[PDB]
């Protein structure tokens, strides 16, 4: 449980994404700070490969759920800090309704004293006048709930949720997500109970920037096991 105790203060975070969508490659390097005692994430991402092909709100969920606030009477159900400092692997299949899809593989682990998250993304089957890559998505993001259950066969967790993205004309595009989180260590982890995780976030822009970027603030908590 030392992996739980190491999150006691601020932790600096660096994240690197190498993505390729329809042969169109790009990178996203993000830096920032995170507080796991109170579930706060303050990050800033920059595209180091020129103009971004894909709207930012689709990539936010790809771009560290070990920084979620668990209350004390639910400390028995914290899987993610149990898998530290060795790390773990996350597999996501992202289904965009009536469009193409994403497949993403990520590794989350400490390097030195910095939590790095590496991510390889492959997106296919999107129509060239689709509202995703036609740049019709709005620059705001909503609050959500994510449902989590155990898996003793892979000794990790299965995760599902469904995101509503905002379009210009008031329409709503839905993206479903499938996710597996499995450790790379072999020691003991915490097998959690069936519960959910609530999320608020805010996207913004930096005034004195010239590159393509995004500034993100996020709050995440967990609930479902409503014990006294």
């Amino acid at each position: 449980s030392k992996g739980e105790e190491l999150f006691t203060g601020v932790v600096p975070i660096l994240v690197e994404l190498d993505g390729d969508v329809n042969g169109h490659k790009f990178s996203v390097r993000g830096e920032g700070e995170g507080d796991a005692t109170n579930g706060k994430l303050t990050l800033k991402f920059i595209c180091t490969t020129g103009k971004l092909p894909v709207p930012w709100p689709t990539l936010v969920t790809t771009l560290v759920q070990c920084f979620s606030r668990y209350p004390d009477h639910m400390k028995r159900h914290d899987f993610f800090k149990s898998a530290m400092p060795e790390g773990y692997v996350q597999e996501r299949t992202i289904s965009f309704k009536d469009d193409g899809t994403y497949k993403t593989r990520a590794e989350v682990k400490f390097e030195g004293d910095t939590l790095v998250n590496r991510i390889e993304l492959k997106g296919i089957d999107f129509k060239e006048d689709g509202n995703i890559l036609g740049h019709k998505l709005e620059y705001n993001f909503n609050s959500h709930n994510v449902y989590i259950t155990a898996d003793k066969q892979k000794n990790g967790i299965k995760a599902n949720f469904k995101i509503r993205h905002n379009v210009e004309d008031g329409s709503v595009q839905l993206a479903d997500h499938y996710q597996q989180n499995t450790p790379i260590g072999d020691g003991p982890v915490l097998l959690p109970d069936n519960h959910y995780l609530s999320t608020q976030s805010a996207l913004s822009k930096d005034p004195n920037e010239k590159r393509d970027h995004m500034v993100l603030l996020e709050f995440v908590t967990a609930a479902g096991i409503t014990h006294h």
Binding site: K44, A202, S204, V215, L217, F219
Partner: protein, 164 residues
């Protein structure tokens, strides 16, 4: 210029006194807008906050994420820093990017005396945020029990006063 912030992050109070004896700007932000006061406001460092404040400092300096020193000192739980920040003219109704006020964060984390201070310095209860929730909601859906109690007391007091 840039070896000031390092000594605030790090708890090196004597190095702060040495840099303040010489000429050094207290209002310095590196890449994001963040100040030695912001850094000494996250981690309690009552001595460094007081010496940065006595030499004159932006008490309400906008972070890139919209945060001010009061937000960080209310999130962390340092009561004395919140007292000395409020006595020096900090605004109790400053907003976060998500829409949070300092009372929202104080109710979210679960500090009681900080809520009692912010309520005694002019913070209002039923102020919404961008997603639409009041501090009472954050208090009830995060297991904080007596924060929700004094908030429900204030709501019932206002509602029963309006019913006449």
């Amino acid at each position: 210029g840039k070896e000031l912030l390092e000594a605030a992050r790090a708890g090196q109070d004597d190095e702060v006194a040495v840099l303040m004896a010489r000429g050094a700007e207290v209002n310095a932000a590196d890449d994001v807008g963040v100040t030695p006061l912001h850094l000494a406001a996250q981690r309690g460092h009552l001595a460094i906050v007081s010496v940065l404040l006595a030499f004159g400092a932006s008490v309400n300096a906008a972070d890139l994420w919209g945060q001010t020193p009061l937000h960080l000192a209310a999130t962390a739980g340092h009561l004395e820093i919140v007292e000395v920040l409020l006595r020096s003219g900090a605004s109790v109704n400053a907003r976060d990017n998500i829409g949070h006020t300092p009372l929202h964060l104080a109710a979210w984390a679960g500090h009681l005396e900080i809520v009692e201070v912010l309520l005694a310095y002019g913070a209002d209860v039923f102020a919404q945020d961008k997603f639409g929730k009041t501090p009472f909601d954050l208090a009830i859906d995060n297991g904080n029990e007596d924060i929700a109690e004094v908030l429900q007391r204030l709501l019932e007091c206002r509602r029963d006063a309006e019913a006449a």
